[PDB]
């Protein structure tokens, strides 16, 4: 209790001394007189906040070496306002003096006070003072006022469309703002109405003869199919007609929609709230869940979502391509060994669903990584046993493309392509437990040597987090007994070294990779020591290097996987 | 409506500005020449560099507004220390700047500097620097290190007998520690010998007001009785004899209150033990954990032989509770055979004699020869036999009928005074409301309740009992009654309070530093008890998270006794 600390009450003592000196009419070093009115404040705090004011007050003239200080060749009102704002830490503005006060604060290099005043003015801006906001922002050129004005425009464009403010606003700026995928919109009809109001008189709307350039900013494929068809029915021959035809073709060819992507088919919404799909939860019975109810660590609470057309599959392989989550196969050995062939792919970005037919693949409980237009499948099993003959397939073309066969038979194992190279580690060839790890690169179409796991575990899948094999621990009876692995370490096979990563609090093989807010979150699996599924998950980031309590899942489940995707504002609206 | 935001890095900016002003060589307003030495510096920076300089030379007095300032007792060492502290922004002591600072601070008339030097010497006190530490302690004798110095002197009295630090050590603190009985000690055999050796020399073992300043009867006499028997005669032996009869007076513990039997400390709170919990949690409460305000949580401890009583009565009569039987049929009847009484004054508990009639959930006042109960009733039904409950004497005798027919009613001593509002004929709401005070044992005249409302939640509002609104099926829905009726004879005016969301029917009454807390309640809409505890302060006009009990029980008795060592240590 004798460590040297840092003084923090010196400023309070200095302010108290300055106030005592000022109240007694002594130690008058800085004096400001405005129209015969005297204002008392502590000059110590004011002179210690910025350097421009200190240099102006004490440049070295005769004013700084006398009881009375005179400022010649300067503006008395601006200097007095700046000094008052710096000393009293308050922004006293009016309906017409807001711009002058903001300019005075900016001249004093006060970011916090100026930003607070600008935010207060924006939040208390009347309709009759609309012209007093844009002009003030243009004249002041504040680093924060422009952003506040842009946010207000983006949030009140709907209200401005009805009023004449939309007409007064620049057309080029409005078009540029609409082009960016950040504006808050509800329906394509509203966007079209806003574009028409920007490109035509508001009174006229309440002229489609001339196709404006800003009309192309509206995403035709993102509109409703019926609405798009109705618009194209009366659409005259023009670039808008071509866009409508392209959108109609994309809608009618939804089977190959991912292969017919266009620059105008981009979404614009959220991106977090990872929503889990599938999986088998022991509580209250072994059934394939079809609801979207997860626990997003970023939000700090359980994720809320509505699963529409969610397939009833457990531990299904999840592959994300073109920002779309696809589920292929999926063993259901929890309720009994039975191979699953039917598979479906969802397209939340396109607001539709696709029934991707799957070919006859002799694999179960296998993970397929879609790298580019081709995919590779590893692990797998025969009809009643495991096998080492791994055959890949391409979901894009439903073709059984040839891939590198597995080095050893894998039972309930997984394999993912790290930096475009499939990796297989641990595993168990039936009763025998495999330990050698082979990283068969899909590009080379052959097996290759890879670094063995730091801990001699079995039935552990291979996952690629941050371009590294972030898998450690594992808990299964294939190691010899139901004994927990007391040694946990992260050995990067790609780098051939024990790269530093976040240690796993619990060891579980075949963990589902889930990245949210740059945090390596792994859940699911079963603990041999506990003799059941693990319902505890921790969301910790090695990069953050912060230890805290991760969100708890709603129920204990196994074989749950998730991926990063853009979520709509409807989920956050509830 | 202006607000003021202060950054946490402004101290560094102020220091940088002061350094820039000092290094500029300009903006000098005060010029002082002392001992023929001429320097240029800022007056504000110089004042802020030191601590006592700002309060001495910048106090706004006549000397602070003069060209020349007179300084007496200021040596070059003090100026060098101030300059070093200003330059390095560090304030600490070392092995080469300890004695010099203490010597130079004696003539500076700075109490803060002397106290800081004494604290630094105490934090760096070794066997080779005993004289310097003693000199620093004598120079300052800070009020914060006095207790530590006294404890160190007492624990090493053998060495302190010949050491000069004993004369400079505090005497009042040592005397207070010696007479104290709550001090942390792992034993009472070697500790007693050490205390005896510290207080008096070994030769004595083998007028003065300080000698009589020790309150032997107030402290624990159980361990000091043997020492006092062999000691000289004193008038403190009467308390030991008086307390001897209290061992065989467990039944009459509240009646045996004595002037020296006052309640030690004011550590009154709510303990999540006792009572019968039926809704909304089907878990029996057994952990007797006491919340620690220093720790902020009720840490678990070894609750060996803890008093486990179920559906026990709750009363506040001079920190002593007396009750007979127990009935909680409104929230679920539960037969129990364990009866416990909370007596923090005696720091002991005993099994009281069970009365013939199980009458409880009423107001018990420590008046007369025994505690009196207002009429009586069975566990859940009214009975034609009227008797008074006397658990202390276990005497079942017929009593006169009460003026108002009340069975299983609710009553408590609010703020140490008995009060009753409206009434209820058990679990069935009635139409006639009469306020009978259990303390007076008579139907005192009061204002008639215009609205048939009862079994509401009562809290401490305007230092008086107040019932506002209510929650029952008499209004036809689960709404709030706009009319609020409160009887405050002492206040003389109605106390406005927010309506109680949960009704309080025959619950335990607890006072914790004039802060009413409600656990459980009555929820007619849910068909069970309240699964959450909420406090609705009228002044706050908002819902705040109060102390959440471990078990959401209703009418759970609170026991105050000696806490476990692990629980006390938190």
Curated annotation (Swiss-Prot), chain B:
It is found in: Cytoplasm, Cytosol; Cytoplasm, Cytoskeleton, Microtubule organizing center, Centrosome; Cytoplasm, Cytoskeleton, Spindle; Nucleus. One of its GO terms (molecular function) is 14-3-3 protein binding. Its main location: cytoplasm. The modification Phosphotyrosine is found at residue 436. The modification Phosphothreonine is found at residues 433, 445. Residues 28-95 form the BTB domain. It comes from the Eukaryota. It holds the Pfam family Kelch_1. Kelch repeats lie at residues 269-319, 320-369, 370-416, 418-463, 464-514, 515-563. One of its GO terms (cellular component) is intercellular bridge. InterPro entries: BACK, BTB-kelch_protein, BTB/POZ_dom, Kelch-typ_b-propeller, Kelch_1, KLHL22_BACK, SKP1/BTB/POZ_sf. Keywords: Acetylation, Cell cycle, Cell division, Cytoplasm, Cytoskeleton, Disease variant, Kelch repeat, Lysosome, Mitosis, Nucleus, Phosphoprotein, Repeat, Ubl conjugation pathway. One of its GO terms (biological process) is positive regulation of T cell activation. SUPFAM superfamilies: Kelch motif, POZ domain. Pathway: Protein modification; protein ubiquitination. Substrate-specific adapter of a BCR (BTB-CUL3-RBX1) E3 ubiquitin ligase complex required for chromosome alignment and localization of PLK1 at kinetochores. The BCR(KLHL22) ubiquitin ligase complex mediates monoubiquitination of PLK1, leading to PLK1 dissociation from phosphoreceptor proteins and subsequent removal from kinetochores, allowing silencing of the spindle assembly checkpoint (SAC) and chromosome segregation. Monoubiquitination of PLK1 does not lead to PLK1 degradation. Potential oncogene that is up-regulated in breast cancer cells and promotes tumor growth. Component of the BCR(KLHL22) E3 ubiquitin ligase complex, at least composed of CUL3, KLHL22 and RBX1. Interacts with PLK1. Interacts with DEPDC5 (via DEP domain); the interaction depends on amino acid availability. Interacts with YWHAE; required for the nuclear localization of KLHL22 upon amino acid starvation. It is linked to Defects in KLHL22 has been found in a patient with isolated coloboma, a defect of the eye characterized by the absence of ocular structures due to abnormal morphogenesis of the optic cup and stalk, and the fusion of the fetal fissure (optic fissure). Isolated colobomas may be associated with an abnormally small eye (microphthalmia) or small cornea. This is Kelch-like protein 22. It comes from Homo sapiens (Human). The lineage of its organism: Eukaryota, Metazoa, Chordata, Craniata, Vertebrata. The gene is KLHL22.
């Amino acid at each position: 209790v004798n460590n040297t600390y840092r003084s923090a009450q010196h400023s309070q003592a200095l302010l108290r001394g300055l106030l005592a000196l000022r109240d007694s009419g002594i130690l008058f070093d800085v004096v400001l007189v405005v129209e015969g009115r005297h204002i008392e404040a502590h000059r110590i705090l004011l002179a210690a906040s910025c350097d421009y004011f200190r240099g102006m007050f004490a440049g070295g003239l005769k004013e700084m070496e006398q009881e009375e200080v005179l400022i010649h060749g300067v503006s008395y009102n601006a200097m007095c306002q700046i000094l008052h704002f710096i000393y009293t830490s308050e922004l006293e503005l009016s309906l017409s003096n807001v711009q002058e006060t903001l300019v005075a604060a900016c001249q004093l290099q006060i970011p916090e006070i100026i930003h607070f005043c600008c935010d207060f003015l924006m939040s208390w801006v009347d309709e009759e003072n609309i012209l007093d906001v844009y002009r003030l922002a243009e004249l002041f050129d504040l680093s924060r006022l422009t952003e506040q004005l842009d946010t207000y425009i983006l949030k009140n464009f709907v209200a401005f469309s009805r009023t004449d403010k939309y007409r007064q606003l620049p057309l080029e700026k409005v078009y540029s703002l609409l082009s960016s995928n950040r504006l808050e919109v509800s329906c394509e009809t509203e966007v079209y109405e806003g574009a028409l109001l920007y490109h035509y008189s508001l009174e006229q709307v309440q002229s489609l003869h001339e196709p404006p350039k800003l009309l192309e900013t509206v995403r035709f494929p993102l509109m409703e199919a019926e609405v798009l068809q109705r618009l194209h029915d009366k659409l005259d021959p023009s670039p808008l007609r071509d866009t409508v035809a392209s959108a109609l073709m994309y809608h009618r060819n939804e089977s190959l929609q991912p292969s017919l992507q266009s620059p105008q088919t981009e979404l614009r919404s959220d991106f977090q709230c990872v929503v889990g799909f599938g999986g088998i939860h022991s509580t209250p019975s072994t059934v394939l869940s079809d609801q979207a109810k997860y626990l997003n660590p970023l939000l700090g609470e359980w994720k809320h979502f509505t699963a529409s057309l969610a397939p009833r599959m457990s531990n299904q392989g999840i592959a994300v391509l073109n920002n779309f989550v696809y589920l292929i196969g999926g063993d259901n050995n929890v309720q009994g060994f039975r191979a699953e062939s039917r598979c479906w792919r969802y397209d939340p970005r396109h607001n539709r669903w696709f029934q991707i037919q799957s070919l006859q693949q002799e694999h179960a409980d296998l993970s397929v990584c879609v790298v580019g237009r081709y995919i590779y499948a590893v692990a797998g099993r025969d009809y009643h046993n495991d096998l080492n003959a791994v055959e890949r397939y391409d979901p894009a073309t439903n073709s059984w493309a040839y891939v590198a066969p597995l080095k050893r038979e894998v039972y309930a194992h997984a394999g993912a392509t790290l930096e475009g190279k499939m990796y297989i580690t641990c595993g168990r060839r039936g009763e025998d437990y495999l330990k050698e790890t082979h990283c068969y690169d899909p590009g080379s179409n052959t097996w290759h040597t890879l670094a063995d796991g730091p801990v001699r575990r079995a039935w552990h899948g291979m996952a690629t987090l941050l371009n590294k094999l972030y898998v450690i621990g594992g808990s299964n009876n294939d190691a010899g007994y139901r004994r927990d692995v007391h040694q946990v370490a992260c050995y990067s096979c790609t780098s051939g070294q024990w790269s530093s990563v976040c240690p796993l609090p619990a060891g579980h093989g075949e963990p589902g990779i889930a990245v949210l807010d740059n945090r390596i979150y792994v859940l699911g699996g079963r603990s041999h020591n506990r003799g059941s599924r693990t319902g505890y998950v921790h969301i910790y980031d090695v990069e953050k290097d912060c230890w805290e309590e991760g969100p708890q899942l709603d129920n204990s489940i196994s074989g749950l996987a998730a991926c990063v995707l853009t979520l709509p504002r409807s989920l956050l609206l509830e």
